[PDB]
Amino acid sequence: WLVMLAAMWCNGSVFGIQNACGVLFVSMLETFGSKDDDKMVFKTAWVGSLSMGMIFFCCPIVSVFTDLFGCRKTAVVGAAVGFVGLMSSSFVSSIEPLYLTYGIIFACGCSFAYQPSLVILGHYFKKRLGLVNGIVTAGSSVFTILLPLLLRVLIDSVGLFYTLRVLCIFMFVLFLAGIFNFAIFKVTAYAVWAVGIPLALFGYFVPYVHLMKHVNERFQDEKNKEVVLMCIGVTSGVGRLLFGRIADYVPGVKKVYLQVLSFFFIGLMSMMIPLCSIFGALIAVCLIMGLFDGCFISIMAPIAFELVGAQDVSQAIGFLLGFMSIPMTVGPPIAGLLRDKLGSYDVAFYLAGVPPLIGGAVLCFIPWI
């Protein structure tokens, strides 16, 4: 009757695996090496990009499915289909079949499982949900911290296919645990916000999938390479807690000024990613980037709440997560193409840090009306 552990496991599994796709990326490059094509980064990044894009895209679909097929049934069938897709992802001997079995089937299963966790909390003990949300966000963040060490030890101990075999247990734990009208876009503020946010999300997912390859090709002498994910996760959680507790200090629609500040710092800090000369500098870059990422994710909701009204928060956020699918599945493949054409990720990260600046330039007009 206490869904705290299930919600913590649900959000941790659906996002911790995706946020730790960088080690999966370099593992796929290692296990699929072939000199017949030099654009292997472009093809391989597409798997994780499509996984994230299909997870974010199916949010209105799973919303309308759960709204009329029950939370329990939809959650359990989504966990089952994600588990069977992830299990089938280990029975693959190439890269092109991994598009469907991981970036489509596993992604749609994860999207079908994650969303009902959000709805099931609305009707159980509808009094102290602030602390409930804080605790579940902290648990998801600590799971996202603890996951990449497990991923790396699984990889270098047993391989990649067996690693995907093992992560089905988390999907098995989630298996055990538990009208999209377009009329909201006629308000100008939500329209400009929901066209500027995906434009600012182009370079967001580039480091989450390509950074591990960057530190592998530049810091092979580094003894512990996953400290980046540790720092990014701990600062993400610190940002979530800090901007769930304090960020309501500023009133009105002006919360996006905190959002544009986060986008400006993450853009400039991604610009500073190739400028690093020592590993500690890159680590600090990751701390500030993760803190502002946690800020962004934590304050993702209140601007929507104050813009589209209280009655359309879930539906508007469903559309906005739907529109965020394109930058996730378009950005990092462009970075891979740039790396393949150039030979390094410095220009790739340089260009990936740019569309946060355009997003910062375009969300500044939100407080106008």
Swiss-Prot record:
Effect of residue 11 to K: Does not affect subcellular localization. Abolishes tryptophan import activity
Annotated keywords: Cell membrane, Membrane, Phosphoprotein, Transmembrane, Transmembrane helix, Transport
Keyword Translocase in record: no
Membrane topology: Multi-pass membrane protein
Annotated GO CC locations: basolateral plasma membrane; cell junction; intracellular membrane-bounded organelle; plasma membrane
Tissues showing expression: Strongly expressed in kidney and skeletal muscle and at lower level in placenta and heart.
PTM field: Not N-glycosylated.
Family listed: Belongs to the major facilitator superfamily. Monocarboxylate porter (TC 2.A.1.13) family.
Protein known as: Monocarboxylate transporter 10
Organism whose genome encodes this protein: Homo sapiens (Human)
